[PDB]
Amino acid sequence: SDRVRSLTLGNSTITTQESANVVVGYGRWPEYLRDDEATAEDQPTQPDVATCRFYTLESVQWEKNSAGWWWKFPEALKDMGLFGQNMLYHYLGRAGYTIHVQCNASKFHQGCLLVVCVPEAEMGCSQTDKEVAAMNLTKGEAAHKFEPTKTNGEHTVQSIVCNAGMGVGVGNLTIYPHQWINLRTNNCATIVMPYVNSVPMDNMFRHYNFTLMVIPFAPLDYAAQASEYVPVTVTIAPMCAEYNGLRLAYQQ
Amino acid sequence: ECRPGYRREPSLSPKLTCLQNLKWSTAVEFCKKKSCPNPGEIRNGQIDVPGGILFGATISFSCNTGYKLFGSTSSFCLISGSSVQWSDPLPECREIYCPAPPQIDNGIIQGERDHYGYRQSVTYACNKGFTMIGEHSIYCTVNNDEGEWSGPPPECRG
Amino acid sequence: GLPVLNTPGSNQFMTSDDFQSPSAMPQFDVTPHMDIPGEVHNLMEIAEVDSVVPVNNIKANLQSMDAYHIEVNTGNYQGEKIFAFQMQPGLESVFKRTLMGEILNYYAHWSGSIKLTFTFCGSAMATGKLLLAYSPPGADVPATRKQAMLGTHMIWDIGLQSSCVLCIPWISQTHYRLVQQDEYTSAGNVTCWYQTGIVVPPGTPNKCVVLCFASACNDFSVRMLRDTPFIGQTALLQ
Amino acid sequence: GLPVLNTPGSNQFMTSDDFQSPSAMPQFDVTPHMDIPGEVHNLMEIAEVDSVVPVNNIKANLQSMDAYHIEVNTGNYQGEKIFAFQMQPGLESVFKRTLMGEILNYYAHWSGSIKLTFTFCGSAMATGKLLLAYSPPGADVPATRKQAMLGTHMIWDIGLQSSCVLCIPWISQTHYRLVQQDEYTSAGNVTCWYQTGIVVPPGTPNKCVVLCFASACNDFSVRMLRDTPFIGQTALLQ
Amino acid sequence: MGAQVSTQKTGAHETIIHYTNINYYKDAASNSANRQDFTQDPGKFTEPVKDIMIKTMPALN
Amino acid sequence: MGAQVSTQKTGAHETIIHYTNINYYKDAASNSANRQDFTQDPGKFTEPVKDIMIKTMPALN
Amino acid sequence: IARVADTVASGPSNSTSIPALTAVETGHTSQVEPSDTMQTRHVKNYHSRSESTVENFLSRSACVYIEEYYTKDQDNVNRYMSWTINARRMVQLRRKFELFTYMRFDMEITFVITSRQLPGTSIAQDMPPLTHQIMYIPPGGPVPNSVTDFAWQTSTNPSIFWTEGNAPPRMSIPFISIGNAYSNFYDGWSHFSQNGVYGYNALNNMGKLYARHVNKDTPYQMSSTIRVYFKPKHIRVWVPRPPRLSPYIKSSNVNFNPTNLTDERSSITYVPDTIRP
Amino acid sequence: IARVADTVASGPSNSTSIPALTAVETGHTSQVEPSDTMQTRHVKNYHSRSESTVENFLSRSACVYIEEYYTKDQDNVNRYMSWTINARRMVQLRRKFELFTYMRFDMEITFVITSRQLPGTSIAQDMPPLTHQIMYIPPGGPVPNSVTDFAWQTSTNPSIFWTEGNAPPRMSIPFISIGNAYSNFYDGWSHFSQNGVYGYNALNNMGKLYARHVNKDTPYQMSSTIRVYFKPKHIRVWVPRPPRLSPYIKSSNVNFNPTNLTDERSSITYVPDTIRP
Numbered sequence A: 001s002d003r004v005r006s007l008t009l010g011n012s013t014i015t016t017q018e019s020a021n022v023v024v025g026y027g028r029w030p031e032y033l034r035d036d037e038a039t040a041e042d043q044p045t046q047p048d049v050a051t052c053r054f055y056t057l058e059s060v061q062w063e064k065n066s067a068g069w070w071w072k073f074p075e076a077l078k079d080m081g082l083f084g085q086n087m088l089y090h091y092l093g094r095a096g097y098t099i100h101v102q103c104n105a106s107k108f109h110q111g112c113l114l115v116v117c118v119p120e121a122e123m124g125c126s127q128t129d130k131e132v133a134a135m136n137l138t139k140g141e142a143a144h145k146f147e148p149t150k151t152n153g154e155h156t157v158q159s160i161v162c163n164a165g166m167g168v169g170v171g172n173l174t175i176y177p178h179q180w181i182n183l184r185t186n187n188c189a190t191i192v193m194p195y196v197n198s199v200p201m202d203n204m205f206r207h208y209n210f211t212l213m214v215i216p217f218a219p220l221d222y223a224a225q226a227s228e229y230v231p232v233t234v235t236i237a238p239m240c241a242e243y244n245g246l247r248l249a250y251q252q
Numbered sequence B: 001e002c003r004p005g006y007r008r009e010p011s012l013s014p015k016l017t018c019l020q021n022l023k024w025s026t027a028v029e030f031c032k033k034k035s036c037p038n039p040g041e042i043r044n045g046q047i048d049v050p051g052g053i054l055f056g057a058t059i060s061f062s063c064n065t066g067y068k069l070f071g072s073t074s075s076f077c078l079i080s081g082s083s084v085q086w087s088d089p090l091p092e093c094r095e096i097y098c099p100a101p102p103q104i105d106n107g108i109i110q111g112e113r114d115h116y117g118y119r120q121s122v123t124y125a126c127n128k129g130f131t132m133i134g135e136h137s138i139y140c141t142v143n144n145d146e147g148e149w150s151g152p153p154p155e156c157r158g
Numbered sequence C, D: 001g002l003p004v005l006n007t008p009g010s011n012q013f014m015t016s017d018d019f020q021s022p023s024a025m026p027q028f029d030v031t032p033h034m035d036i037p038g039e040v041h042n043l044m045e046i047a048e049v050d051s052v053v054p055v056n057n058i059k060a061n062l063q064s065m066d067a068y069h070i071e072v073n074t075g076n077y078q079g080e081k082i083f084a085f086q087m088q089p090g091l092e093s094v095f096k097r098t099l100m101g102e103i104l105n106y107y108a109h110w111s112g113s114i115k116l117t118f119t120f121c122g123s124a125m126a127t128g129k130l131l132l133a134y135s136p137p138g139a140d141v142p143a144t145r146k147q148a149m150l151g152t153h154m155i156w157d158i159g160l161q162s163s164c165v166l167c168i169p170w171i172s173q174t175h176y177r178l179v180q181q182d183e184y185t186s187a188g189n190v191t192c193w194y195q196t197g198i199v200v201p202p203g204t205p206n207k208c209v210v211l212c213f214a215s216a217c218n219d220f221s222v223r224m225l226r227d228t229p230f231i232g233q234t235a236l237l238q
Numbered sequence E, F: 001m002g003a004q005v006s007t008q009k010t011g012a013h014e015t016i017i018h019y020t021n022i023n024y025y026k027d028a029a030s031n032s033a034n035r036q037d038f039t040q041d042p043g044k045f046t047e048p049v050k051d052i053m054i055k056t057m058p059a060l061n
Numbered sequence G, H: 001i002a003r004v005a006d007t008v009a010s011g012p013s014n015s016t017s018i019p020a021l022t023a024v025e026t027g028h029t030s031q032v033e034p035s036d037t038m039q040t041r042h043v044k045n046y047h048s049r050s051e052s053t054v055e056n057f058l059s060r061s062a063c064v065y066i067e068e069y070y071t072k073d074q075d076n077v078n079r080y081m082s083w084t085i086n087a088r089r090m091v092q093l094r095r096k097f098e099l100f101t102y103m104r105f106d107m108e109i110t111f112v113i114t115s116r117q118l119p120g121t122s123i124a125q126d127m128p129p130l131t132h133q134i135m136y137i138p139p140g141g142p143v144p145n146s147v148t149d150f151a152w153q154t155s156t157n158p159s160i161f162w163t164e165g166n167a168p169p170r171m172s173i174p175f176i177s178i179g180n181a182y183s184n185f186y187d188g189w190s191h192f193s194q195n196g197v198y199g200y201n202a203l204n205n206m207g208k209l210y211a212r213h214v215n216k217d218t219p220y221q222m223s224s225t226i227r228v229y230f231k232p233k234h235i236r237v238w239v240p241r242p243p244r245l246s247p248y249i250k251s252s253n254v255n256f257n258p259t260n261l262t263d264e265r266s267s268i269t270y271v272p273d274t275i276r277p
């Protein structure tokens, strides 16, 4: 049975009895930087099991009127164990990441989520005449959510779902590494993202390599007396984490 | 000693030394800005964080299309007593409703509803023996924080 | 020097030419090549990727997820057409904006089959059978299930396998068709009906969402490079 | 003659082209070649030569040898930063004019390590240990020795060997950086502190000069030819 | 010279169809476009799954 | 002719990259620049010392 | 060579083979073809995806900028052109480039310069051919502040001198980016404190381009309009993405207004009756 | 070929090896690299110093002179150009050449000639294309004193005839210097008594260059501006030297005004805080 699967990274292990295979980035699997592609001359540090493990973020509640959510990495993991510590003390970073979104219900509930990883998910502002604030793009492990209607915020992100806050069609986000969580068949979604960037390495605070978006295309629904609380938890584990440029920790 | 509202940085000395050159030693960030509470979430709204949420920071609010904002359009992280606190509470984004759809002579509305919000629609149907003149449906448009039907209802000619 | 005679078309500038030209930056050391994930070689690699289709593109849903929703209900609905649309990958408002159609709009000619994947998003207890039919140009759109059933159809049985593919074969007179399809290069229509019905147990929703995906097959191809009519401006941006 | 078609860019004149052209002086007998000492093949041969750096470039010394002087004194000076500056070989006012930086200004891109050689010019009786640190971009400039010590540093012990080299490794995200460095292509900072202190015997100066030299390594290289912004005029000279 | 003969794209009189080319400039950036590179690998986007899925079989089992 | 094929500078599609050249004029001064002469010897300016100095050793002893 | 797949002849079926059934949840795009869901005939497909190549798709000169500069020094008219090179002010080409996240390629740049004589009552002239000068100034180089600035000496900056009447000037440039590939999207900032510039402008810096008339002066006011064209060649693209849906507002960011997913229609079952004998 | 040195992977250390310690007194530039003062990783550096070549550096057309000459003989306007060839009147190119003491190379000379019609109330003309004549006169040759001097016969002196509209005239010249190399600096005199001329002008003498309109006369006054461009090729340079710091004052000597070594700043420890969240 390919339904059941097990994931093991570091001192963490995830279990599943209702998965749907595993999407591996753009056909590639996380790998350390090679010598014929490196730029930083200093010998990198590789904490390995210390940083490459499963980090669970704050759960989110899926409601009949939920429009979606989104996280930005590696920023969202700035306060996660040693992975966040290396981000502070190092100028350059490089990691893989294994996204694992969980969400279970019952054979009597219905709904369908879209777990996607969007590289360089540059987003727009609510007020097209102004700019956006980092605080409105990503706020730690705290998820930002999409709205079923237009936003008005000064420096807020245009959370209107239909445009995914990028000025595009949500139905075309399938062009990015993704999976769906169709409650009647699924229970979770896993995506192994390889380091994608136009540079061997990059800062992890200044640059948001990719954005994880969970947009429901099939509204959550159910009958009376059926558990109304359906949470959606996101777990991610860095892979082949390398760091360069060691210096005094950065004051957030 | 940290001012209000700042907090001590355990990794640094809140002390200064008078150097031989009669200059005080370079000061570090031994006292940093106290961070404000996480603004939270606005149902059918958005919080704009232009410059973080620490003391002195500002945040603006907006409501998605189809919702009207009720309350403040912004909040400042001011110092409140023993800590930094948001100046104004989170506002409210209440659904904009269209006026009751119009009833038409010799026709009905199919599956008439209680309320009608942005993008919702009403489809008419002429009674037996009558013919529909115009579009079957109209749609609740919500420019501009006030709800309005897209156009006029169809008409039924006998 | 060598006696030469200039031919017509000299000194002109054709945006689609392809000649050699002196480099303004001699001996420039290009930045080392880096193997980046997900490289694209042919645009068809994109048009072959399924993308959600906004079948329910009614004025009231042009800006909501309902545009993608294709409701199905329990109870007798025989003779009722669940949905329908023309087969214009680049002209039909339903496909016009999908990854597939979005690319076709950069070309004037197209050819090949299309994969319409349907996914049932109801509960695990809901069951049912739908009839996905495709009728080539020539006759009126199927008004009844019998008429639709006479054409290329697929009877989808909802079960553990959530999705079901309705491959629309390329049944054209000419080798290619215009993205800006006219009546001459008509492709036909696609109508969905209830083969049986959607039965459901007590304490379970009666309305379910059915998503639609569209993508090109291994026999698809575009041909006439043109500018897309989905982007323009009135003055230089700033 | 041979049918020919002129391509765009004909009859134009690009200052960086490279074609053949008739000699205005046919069969001219060039003066015999003479082997002259010190021939230059690549400009990098120059940027690799140490040149005194004006670290003390304060308004009052912009025209005196004090601009190169980096004083160090005896007595307690713990927690005091001897000096500091950004790592902008071509933009930083400190390097901007050195042989190295002077050349980088003829290019827009640069890459490689830099050798900062420090020479103690005090008396043969003066002793001491200095901490030469380099912090890559990302955090605030080291306010204390502890903060600076966390980065790439070199503890120089003054002795018979007058000079000490602090090689600043190329720790960048991108392969190259702009000479006109911005925040994106930041390189970091270099701060000097007192590891211990400068002890001296009786009847000996208490203030000493420490010269700084800067040059490129064997892994350095420029790339984008441009005009230097350190020379101009308002009319033809006479 | 360093002439290099290649194959031309089919004409409207098919079913001497080759051209000659020589680079005159020292920089590769001066050469003409590579309109004849026909490589493909949709797998990256259409089948980026870890476990090979056989068409004639159930996606899940 | 007296054609001479050389190697072009790497392009933006690396990892037929050669050009042909023929001189038409009788004077060498008419030829194009020698943008491909990559000789080096920094020793003249960086290490013009009479006694070889080994990096890993003391400059003076 | 770049041929399309042929259709194998298929006959009746009745087995446990379920090529039509699948699960999109896996993120896997069905690889089904007509022969899998019906009876098909053998067809030797000779069609080719030769024009779908990223090379043939992007390798076509497209206008990226346009400015006007006058000859005489009258009023507050600019006598020279200035431009911070980028392809974000022309929606057409900008939308194509944005189909991919990263790009790598050399480029052919062509200039279409045209002049004219401004209207007037008495404007009888006899001006010789107008010669123009286009100078590229990489980041950091000295910028001219007049049509007689020393910067126009073009000591080391690449520059072109073109006289009207002749074919539009052209010249190729390699892969300038200091990175391993040009970036169309940068979801990051210019400063480590996560502020300052956000997006493209945060890292892209191809320098500036200046133009002018090398002619001293014209009896009566005249103006010229230069149009810059880009034609990438030896192309490489990575990470494809959803095409632009909302109209472009600014050329510095991706701001947009909530746009409709697509055009509307009567109902989900609406299909125009085109057969009416 | 012109590749850069790679960085060998280095590990911990603890020996009597002192690569970091040295003595600049020897006049020897430290040959240390990152791997000598820290732990480094192996890096296959593919960078190339191909554009740092003295050839690629100096082989770029740069303006060296510019003069204006009129067509009609009205007032005291020069109808022809005269110029004592040298590259010391254009700071840009002059500064590069002066990076080295001696130079040897052939050269490509390009001319950008443009004309115009001087302003006026009634200046309606119909002048045919203007043809120009540039004549080089090596030291000693007869110099023309008018636009109709016999010297323009160009019996043996090299000369170019160019008509407006066509591509700017060009032509190469070998290594003229009577010495084994051109001299950018001459710390000596012209006379043995240590007086007379001092420096460049004391020995350099490339002759003169004259220009004019071959057209007899124009109905109304018109003027042309010729710009000379130099592009050394097949270059050789010796004895590098400190780049020019003080602005150029005269084109005959190295006179200068006490200039600052560089820009100023707050203090030796001043470093702008660019991180402010």
Ligand SMILES: CCCCCCCCCCCC(=O)O
Binding pocket: C024, G085, G086, G087, G097, G103, G109, G136, G158, G173, G176, G182, G183, G184, G204, G206
């Ligand atoms: C000599 C002119 C130089 C012009 C440089 C143009 C570089 C274009 C780079 C486009 C980058 C992008 O589209 O992401």
Ligand SMILES: CCCCCCCCCCCC(=O)O
Binding pocket: D024, H085, H086, H087, H097, H103, H109, H136, H158, H173, H176, H182, H183, H184, H204, H206
């Ligand atoms: C036919 C025109 C002849 C022009 C001769 C120009 C010679 C330039 C020599 C430059 C000498 C120097 O720069 O030191």
